[PDB]
Every structure is written in C-alpha cells, then in structure tokens.
Design a protein around this ligand. Structure first.
Ligand SMILES: [Cl-]
Ligand SMILES: [Cl-]
Lengths: 151, 151
C-alpha cells in the first residue's frame, strides 16, 4: 500500500506554502490509492488492447495523454517505492513490465497527485483561504477526474 | 462535421421526457465535437502506443474502460454517419481502421453523449426542473469528464 506520509508530501508539493487540513488529508488518503488503482487498471486496458504482454513506457504515455496530466515525464518530485507501485500494477493484472514503464506509472500517479494539490490550492484561493480544506480537494477530484473521481 | 440535429437527438435520448433549452443545445454543440475529437486523439494515443497501425475494436474498448462510459457495446441509439466519424479519426492521425473499430468509436461518442444527457437530466431533477438547462449540461461536463471537460 501507498504510505499516507508519502501521499501527503506529494500532494503538498502542489499547494505551495498553504496549510493542509485534516479533512483534506482524509480525502486524499481515501482517493489517491483508488486513483492509483484506477490508473493501473487503465494501464492494463491499454496493454491488453495492445497485443503485448509487457507494459512499456508508451502505454503509460497514452494514459497521461488521455487523462491530460501535464508534466509527467519531467516530474522530479517524490516518488513512491518501486516495489509498491509494481505491486499495484501486478494487482491490476500487469504480469510483465519494463523498468521504464514502472517509473512512468510512478511519475504519472505522483504528478497526478501533485496536480490535484495544485487544483485544490486554486479552490482555496477562490475562497480567500490559506488552508486547503476537504471541500477544495473534493472539488478538485470531481472537476479533474472522469466520472467525478468516482474511480 | 457532426450534425447539430444528430447531436441533439442523441443527447436527448438520455433526458427522457424532459425539455431541452437553447443554452443546453448551445453547450452540447460546442462540446460534443470537441469530445469526439478528444476521443479520436485518445484512440490514436492508444494505437501508437500499441505497436499497430490499424485501429481495432480493442483500442476503443480500452478508452471506454478508462473514461468509464457504460453500456457502449450495447448502445443501440442513433449513430453518426460512418464517413463523418471516420474523418474525425483520420484527422486524429488514424490512417487505418477496421470497420468494427469505427463502429465502436461511433458507439462510444454517441453513448458518451447520451450519458451526458442522463447526467444533465439528473442535475435538472436536483433543481426540480422539467427542462435541462445550460447549467445542467455544464455541470454534467465538468463532473463527468477529465479536466472539467476542457477537452
Ligand atoms: Cl519501456
Ligand atoms: Cl477490430
């Protein structure tokens, strides 16, 4: 499982100097692992359609382009542990992956989390607040993800 | 280009017996072609990653699974013309497609449009209205699509 402390640091990379409330952390702890699983299942979908058994970079690049996550390749923030993210992929049915595929999946989910923090920060700004609150995170999820983030 | 009359009929398949305002039609005329293009570009992304040059059903099935559009394969409503949707795919870079791929792309964009109508209908219900209004469509787009529907 993705550690909560790492989820928080990564999300916080996107909020600048703002504070983060507990209900915001609660939201991201529930959501980020579900998003990671969703992304891993999507990666399997892009690879089973692809006629290959090995997950490669190009499969995760396609997911980033369709989820419209910006700056994935250039992401240089905190990453989860390789074995942890590889196990999420394995649970999604990914029997074989290249190291570069694993790394790009990791950059995708981490960058997506950071991007969520940026969006939540934007909602806090809208309400003239210094702290990112659970409502900002909820709105960021619904807006930014398909199906309102019910992933 | 996708005809507006067809966009409207398809969207209206999802609103039951509700009325549709002009600002709702305005919204869907702007949005549905952008969504169709987005989906076609995504289809290219899933096929260039895939090592194949021919778009096949399995590529559009992967997109449906990641956009979480329900009931695509079983869709039996109005479809756009094959040549029109094939040209959208060609513009997205799809040089070669199978007939079944084209048909599944068509079912995906049409079912996605109908599903948008269902979601918009749900927002009108929430406000105790019989007519689906531009605000319902806007909320349906933002909620249901990635990046708030800024596709
Ligand atoms: Cl690779
Ligand atoms: Cl096919």
């Amino acid at each position: 499982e993705l550690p909560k402390a790492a989820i928080e640091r990564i999300f916080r990379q996107g909020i600048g100097e703002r504070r983060l409330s507990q209900d915001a952390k609660d939201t991201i702890y529930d959501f980020v692992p579900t998003m990671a699983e969703y992304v891993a299942n999507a990666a399997k979908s892009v690879l089973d359609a692809s006629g290959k058994k090995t997950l490669m970079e190009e499969h995760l690049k396609a997911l980033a382009d369709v989820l419209m996550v910006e700056g994935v390749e250039d992401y240089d923030g905190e990453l989860f542990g390789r074995a942890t993210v590889r196990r999420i992929l394995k649970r999604a049915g990914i029997e074989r992956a290249s190291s570069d595929a694993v790394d790009l999946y990791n950059k995708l989910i981490c960058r997506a989390t950071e991007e969520l923090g940026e969006k939540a920060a934007e909602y806090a700004d809208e309400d003239g607040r210094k702290t990112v609150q659970g409502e900002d995170v909820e709105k960021a999820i619904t807006y930014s993800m398909p199906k309102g983030g019910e992933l």
